[PDB]
Amino acid sequence: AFTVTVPKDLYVVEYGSNMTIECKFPVEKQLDLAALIVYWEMEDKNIIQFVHGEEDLKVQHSSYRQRARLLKDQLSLGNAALQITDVKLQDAGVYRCMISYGGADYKRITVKVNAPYAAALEHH
Amino acid sequence: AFTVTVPKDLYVVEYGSNMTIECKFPVEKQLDLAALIVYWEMEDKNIIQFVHGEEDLKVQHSSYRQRARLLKDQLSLGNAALQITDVKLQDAGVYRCMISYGGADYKRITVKVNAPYAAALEHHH
Amino acid sequence: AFTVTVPKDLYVVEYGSNMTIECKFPVEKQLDLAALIVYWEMEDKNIIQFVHGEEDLKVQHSSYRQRARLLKDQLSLGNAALQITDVKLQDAGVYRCMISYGGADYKRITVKVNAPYAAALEHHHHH
Amino acid sequence: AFTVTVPKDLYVVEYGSNMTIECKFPVEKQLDLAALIVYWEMEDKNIIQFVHGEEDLKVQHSSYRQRARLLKDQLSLGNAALQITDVKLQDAGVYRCMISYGGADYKRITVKVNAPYAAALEHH
Numbered sequence: 001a002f003t004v005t006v007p008k009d010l011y012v013v014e015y016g017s018n019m020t021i022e023c024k025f026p027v028e029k030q031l032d033l034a035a036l037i038v039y040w041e042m043e044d045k046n047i048i049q050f051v052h053g054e055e056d057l058k059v060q061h062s063s064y065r066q067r068a069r070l071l072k073d074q075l076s077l078g079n080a081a082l083q084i085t086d087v088k089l090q091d092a093g094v095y096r097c098m099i100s101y102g103g104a105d106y107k108r109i110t111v112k113v114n115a116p117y118a119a120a121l122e123h124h
Numbered sequence: 125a126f127t128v129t130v131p132k133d134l135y136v137v138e139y140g141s142n143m144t145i146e147c148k149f150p151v152e153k154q155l156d157l158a159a160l161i162v163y164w165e166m167e168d169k170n171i172i173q174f175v176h177g178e179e180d181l182k183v184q185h186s187s188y189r190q191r192a193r194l195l196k197d198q199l200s201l202g203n204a205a206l207q208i209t210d211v212k213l214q215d216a217g218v219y220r221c222m223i224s225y226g227g228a229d230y231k232r233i234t235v236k237v238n239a240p241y242a243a244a245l246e247h248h249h
Numbered sequence: 250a251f252t253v254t255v256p257k258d259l260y261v262v263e264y265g266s267n268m269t270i271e272c273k274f275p276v277e278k279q280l281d282l283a284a285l286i287v288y289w290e291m292e293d294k295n296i297i298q299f300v301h302g303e304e305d306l307k308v309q310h311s312s313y314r315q316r317a318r319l320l321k322d323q324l325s326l327g328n329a330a331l332q333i334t335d336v337k338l339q340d341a342g343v344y345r346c347m348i349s350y351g352g353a354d355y356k357r358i359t360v361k362v363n364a365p366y367a368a369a370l371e372h373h374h375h376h
Numbered sequence: 377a378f379t380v381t382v383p384k385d386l387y388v389v390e391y392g393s394n395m396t397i398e399c400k401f402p403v404e405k406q407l408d409l410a411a412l413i414v415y416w417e418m419e420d421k422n423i424i425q426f427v428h429g430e431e432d433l434k435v436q437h438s439s440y441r442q443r444a445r446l447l448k449d450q451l452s453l454g455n456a457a458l459q460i461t462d463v464k465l466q467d468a469g470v471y472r473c474m475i476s477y478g479g480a481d482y483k484r485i486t487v488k489v490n491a492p493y494a495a496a497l498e499h500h
């Protein structure tokens with residue numbers, strides 16, 4: 001049936017850098033945006049809400065405003081790519097991509113953030 | 125849009141008894157089973173996967189073998205009801221019902237388990 | 250060797266009741282209160298700091314001020330007993346009794362709180 | 377009014393490096409050895425049990441075989457430092473320096489371990 005795959009299970013990112021975490025899902029022919037729903041979260045906090053082809057920033061959690069985006073152009077190749085800028089220590093943890101596309105599945109990804117001491121002190 | 129609702133997001137449960145935790149979803153006219161997908165999990169342990177009209181016990185966690193049931197009758201009422209038999213202390217925690225039915229959503233339900241000393245001491249290892 | 254000991258390391262208590270958690274330490278002759286130090290703590294919130302007979306009220310968490318006390322009567326019997334009145338769901342978790350009395354040791358104790366749905370609903374939404 | 381004190385609350389150390397976590401206490405006049413118990417632990421695990429001038433390594437936890445040692449000549453200066461060799465990701469977490477010396481206190485130290493991708497991938 002329908003399966004979301006994560007080739008990369010684990011991301012190790014430096015404080016302040018960028019990360020793009022990815023989930024694959026089968027697109028047989030052209031992509032039908034009307035039947036596609038892509039939800040991204042970490043630890044119950046909403047990051048991405050993609051329905052009928054568009055982002056909805058209504059329940060996007062405070063700490064991800066203007067740092068996170070779904071790369072709409074990857075969707076046609078069957079890649080839900082969540083791009084996050086200016087990574088913080090609070091971004092470490094488990095993420096989840098939930099995809100509904102004539103079928104539905106989700107996977108998790110684990111993010112680890114390395115940081116020097118000054119950033120680590122402020123987050124303590 | 126498509127909203128999953130939970131009438132109770134907190135259940136309090138006596139050890140060893142049975143519980144049914146519920147998630148409601150919109151059913152327009154008559155349920156189309158072909159278009160319905162339901163996952164029930166707790167803390168990343170899969171309990172139920174329901175696809176194409178049947179229960180998938182594929183990545184089910186072993187502590188839910190023969191204890192966890194989805195009431196199929198209630199799906200046609202728009203009610204994804206998870207029944208868990210003989211509740212144990214390890215059943216305490218956060219549950220997720222994930223529902224795809226032309227649209228998609230999920231809700232969390234917290235289950236608290238009360239137990240007397242004898243059960244609690246055995247769970248203590 | 251100085252061995253702090255615990256008769257129950259597991260307590261199961263109902264919401265709203267009172268609990269007394271016991272820690273025992275050897276007292277061979279008469280109690281020398283000047284050499285006794287008792288700390289009671291719950292997941293790094295300090296509940297009692299008892300030094301040389303004086304209960305330190307500098308660092309008692311707001312959560313336990315008004316509800317926790319050390320039973321001074323049992324000290325010369327070799328018992329450092331923490332009493333918590335009107336148990337709340339917040340009280341559940343691992344406690345430590347740390348004792349310095351010519352030597353030093355500590356023990357952990359796990360506390361589980363049962364509560365009716367009504368108390369559980371209050372804590373779930375408003376704690 | 378004996379008080380244990382730590383120069384720094386937080387350590388950020390690299391995987392595979394060596395770490396000394398420092399901890400201090402009242403010793404104005406010197407230097408009765410026999411009134412001294414030093415106990416180092418990490419999240420319930422015993423690392424260091426110092427009494428009467430020697431470590432007793434019967435309670436020492438298995439993950440600290442050959443890697444944890446107290447450096448005993450600086451206690452005279454009021455310094456009880458725990459040395460950890462070949463820092464592993466397992467070593468991240470909250471440490472406790474417990475000292476009884478005519479009085480008793482203890483202080484917490486948090487350790488965070490940065491590691492490259494290839495090190496993080498095992499575990500995961």
Ligand SMILES: COc1cc(OCc2cccc(-c3ccccc3)c2C)cc(OC)c1CNCCNC(C)=O
Nearest residue numbers: 039098099100104105125126127222223224228229230
């Ligand atoms: C937690 O708030 C969510 C979560 C969403 O996950 C959707 C999702 C996507 C892909 C797949 C799945 C899914 C996976 C496995 C089984 C069943 C379903 C889901 C579960 C989608 C969401 O809005 C589209 C919202 C937010 N709104 C909640 C109610 N209002 C609306 C407009 O809806």
Ligand SMILES: COc1cc(OCc2cccc(-c3ccccc3)c2C)cc(OC)c1CNCCNC(C)=O
Nearest residue numbers: 252288347348349353354355413415474475476480481
């Ligand atoms: C948990 O095994 C410990 C823990 C120890 O903490 C020592 C310590 C050091 C300095 C201070 C303190 C302390 C701090 C604040 C207030 C009161 C006391 C402690 C508490 C010291 C220990 O041996 C010196 C041992 C081993 N005890 C052997 C008995 N074994 C059993 C099973 O029964």
